[PDB]
Write a protein that binds this ligand. Structure first.
Ligand SMILES: COc1cc(C(=O)NC2CCN(C)CC2)ccc1Nc1ncc2c(n1)N(C1CCCC1)CC(F)(F)C(=O)N2C
Ligand SMILES: [Cl-]
Length: 110
């Protein structure tokens, strides 16, 4: 990994760590819309994204730069803001995890 992608990998590891598990856990795995009863999920959300997919793409060297990584993480949050009422608990959890992400992403070496 490049220096910037090392920083992204560190962010990823942090977002998956026990320190943030109380609000990060809905984002660990792909939304299983059928299991959750969300039968309109894939009509509303065109591009699903989750942290296990980000992790697989990092491991496979899919991301060519930090911007591509950031776009996927932010896409995950945007899907949550699109599908759920703004006052829902899961949106509150998204906001808190995105705060962790954005403040550490801003510390990118450059
Ligand atoms: C097994 O996992 C869960 C279990 C329970 C669970 O067990 N809920 C209760 C069931 C009955 N008892 C056990 C109390 C908890 C609830 C949610 C789960 N998982 C999940 N992952 C991701 C999302 C999500 N949920 N969101 C929630 C909001 C409300 C309806 C799903 C909707 C969403 F659109 F998919 C979304 O954006 N995200 C980010
Ligand atoms: Cl972006």
């Amino acid at each position: 990994l490049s220096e910037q992608l090392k920083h992204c990998n560190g962010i990823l590891k942090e977002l998956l760590s026990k320190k943030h598990a109380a609000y990060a856990w809905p984002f660990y795995k792909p939304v299983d819309a059928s299991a959750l009863g969300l039968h309109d999920y894939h009509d509303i959300i065109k591009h699903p994204m989750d942290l296990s997919t980000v992790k697989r793409k990092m491991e496979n060297r899919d991301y060519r730069d930090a911007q591509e990584f950031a776009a996927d993480v932010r896409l995950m949050f945007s899907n949550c803001y699109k599908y759920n009422p703004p006052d829902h608990d899961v949106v509150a959890m998204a906001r808190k995890l995105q705060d962790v992400f954005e403040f550490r992403y801003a510390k990118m070496p450059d």
